[PDB]
Amino acid sequence: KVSALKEKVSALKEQFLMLMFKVSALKEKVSALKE
Amino acid sequence: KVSALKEKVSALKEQFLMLMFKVSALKEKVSALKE
Amino acid sequence: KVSALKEKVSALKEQFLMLMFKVSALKEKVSALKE
């Protein structure tokens, strides 16, 4: 169970990094429209 | 402790799915403003 | 291992809260551009 959990947290950390990239890119695009 | 942790990860995975939906919907709205 | 995992989940929950704030602030900014 602890091993399954560690893999689940690993995959969720990878998901978070990809969503942080997606949100930073969106924030920059919105700043190009409006300061 | 392992059980408490599994529930905490479960709830955080549900949180992530809802934030992915929110960010995809926002990305589409921003693309409607600017390609 | 369980302790390391609990800290990893703690830090990821703090990361999520900060990304939820960032996305809510971006959503409001986009609504100021377009209803």
Dist. CA A17–CA B16, nearest whole Å: 12
Residues of C in contact with A32 (CB under 8 A): none
Resolution in A: 1.1
Residues of A in contact with B15 (CB under 8 A): none
Interchain contact, C20 vs B19, CB within 8 Å: yes
Residues of B in contact with C34 (CB under 8 A): 29, 32-33
Interchain contact, C27 vs B26, CB within 8 Å: yes
Dist. CA C2–CA A1, nearest whole Å: 10
Is residue B32 within 8 angstroms of chain C, CB to CB? yes
Q: What value, to the nearest 5°, has the Cα angle with vertex C29 and ends C25 and C33? A: 165
Dist. CA B32–CA B26, nearest whole Å: 10
- Structural domain count, chain C: 1
Q: What is the amino acid identity at position A28?
A: E
Using alpha carbons, select from B28, A21, B5 the residue that is nearest to residue C19.
A21
Provide the token pair at A27. 């924030």
Dihedral of the alpha carbons of C7, C13, C16, C21, in degrees to the nearest 10: -120
User: A33 and C33 in contact (C-beta within 8 Å)?
Assistant: yes
Say if residue C24 is exposed, middle or buried (CB neighbours under 10 Å; 0-12, 13-18, 19+): exposed
